[PDB]
Design a protein around this ligand. Structure first.
Ligand SMILES: O=C1CC[C@H](N2C(=O)c3ccccc3C2=O)C(=O)N1
Ligand SMILES: [Zn+2]
Length: 97
């Protein structure tokens, strides 16, 4: 009901609408849903900064633990002074609803 599940298998809650936050800037200074917390995702490989959509963070591929759908990435901060130190960037179209 606040629940966002893997679209492919519909078994797993991946996150909730409660966890949604926005790193995008609201002044003169979408497709990716960023959430503080998520569940039921397996991380693949190791963090990389190449082409990172969120400068300062590295990414690790995250897939649904049940059906292996590529749902998004775990983003991890490269510096200790950043907040959050970690979040999830989730492909909206890989989630239901
Ligand atoms: O922060 C991110 C997550 C990974 C994402 N990524 C991809 O989605 C992709 C597809 C094919 C070749 C290379 C990449 C790449 O780095 C990307 O470009 N930046
Ligand atoms: Zn799944």
């Amino acid at each position: 009901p606040t629940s966002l599940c893997c679209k492919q298998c519909q078994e797993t809650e991946i996150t909730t609408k409660n966890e949604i936050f926005s790193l995008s800037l609201c002044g003169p200074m979408h497709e990716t849903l960023t959430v503080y917390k998520a569940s039921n995702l397996n991380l693949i490989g190791r963090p990389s900064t190449v082409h990172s959509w969120f400068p300062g963070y590295a990414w690790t591929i995250a897939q649904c633990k049940i059906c292996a759908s590529h749902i998004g990435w775990k983003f991890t901060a490269t510096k200790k002074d950043m907040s959050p130190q970690k979040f999830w960037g989730l492909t909206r179209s890989a989630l239901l609803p």
